[PDB]
């Protein structure tokens, strides 16, 4: 799929406007944007980045890492993901950094998903569900988490996101409601962050290929 | 001036432990008490499951086992002070930075009963400012966005660390009629870790010390 990566990404640059600084994300996708970013690095200000892993290959490629605290907020946040539906709904933490992805992607005003049609899927969930959690609440997290949806918690073990936490996979779910689904496990204590982006989705889904297909 | 108050309390709460039990322990200096009495019936303890690094030291100075929460699973009971509390047993909590940890072994817990002096009892939660636990790099960001929702007023606690990495904004100037709307809200921004309201999970019993305690 990486020619409908790259393709993606590509398109992706159109919404690059001069001036910017643009929210950045993570994985092989965002790989192809940032490589793209950098030829026209002399019109942008700089990027926000949802991980150390792209800030090394933003820094890289010599653009300018800027810290969200600095920025304020974005106009533009380019990222990719698991799963995406119908209705824009995404899963995300494949690479486990969900957690910096949606608090830059809530701090821009348009979220631009980059993904190759494998992503494209009619309901959330054969990809596992990734949940960032206190280490200590790890155990307790499981045991709600599949008393409330029936599906399978799995330790990704040995795995420590750039907060310093653990992640839980959430196997075998149907997310028909991942508005509600969303809502329910934020509830949760220990609970850092939830890989459904629902409450605030992709805003453009690009889909690569030739043309990429703009939802 | 409320020491008194505080060790009258704990020392009520210590009726509700049983023997054998795995006891969770909540932190601050009323819980000080706690720790201090559970020391006194060590030998009817299996051990603890500690809110902050502060209370494992105070624990292990006595000799009383220490138990990860994953290891132990759910417990029986927690016990913990607040920054405040109102009619309906919703409570404020976080003045010492520990709420994370705290409101994790809460919901683990079957009863959680609540150890203050009566100057925590409030009509109102939010005169003392509500602490809110956040990733750093949304820090700005999560502080734009309560003080945009509540029109409360948002501080960082600059300089403090919590025993999880992250960094505590205190909001200011709120009157929290509805404290599980606010903390169901709260919970759904992204970079929030936790809220310092216990409100969908409140206190089962709150113990203000006195002579003698009263129990509510």
């Not at 690059?16 to 996708?29: C, F, L, P, Q």
Request: hydrophobic residues 40%.
């Amino acid at each position: 799929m990486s020619e409908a990566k790259r393709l993606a990404a590509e398109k992706a640059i159109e919404y690059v406007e001069d001036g910017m600084i643009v929210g950045v994300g993570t994985g092989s996708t965002v790989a192809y944007f940032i490589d793209a970013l950098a030829r026209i690095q002399h019109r942008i200000k700089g990027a926000v980045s949802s991980s150390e892993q792209s800030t090394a290959r933003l820094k890289q490629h010599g653009i300018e890492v800027i810290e969200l605290n600095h920025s304020g907020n974005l106009s533009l946040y380019v990222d990719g993901a698991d799963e995406c539906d119908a209705n824009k709904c995404l899963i995300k933490g494949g690479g486990a950094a969900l957690t910096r992805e949606k608090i830059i992607a809530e701090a821009s005003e348009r979220f631009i998903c980059i993904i190759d049609p494998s992503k494209q899927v009619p309901v959330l969930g054969r990809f596992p569900l990734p949940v960032e959690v206190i280490p200590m609440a790890r155990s307790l997290v499981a045991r709600q988490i599949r008393d409330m949806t029936g599906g399978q918690p799995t330790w990704r073990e040995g795995v420590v996101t750039d907060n310093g936490n653990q992640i839980l996979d959430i196997h075998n779910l149907q997310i028909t409601d991942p508005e509600k689904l969303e809502r329910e496990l934020n509830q949760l204590p220990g609970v850092v962050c939830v890989g459904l982006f629902a409450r605030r989705r992709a805003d453009v889904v690009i889909v690569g290929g030739e043309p990429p297909v703009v939802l």
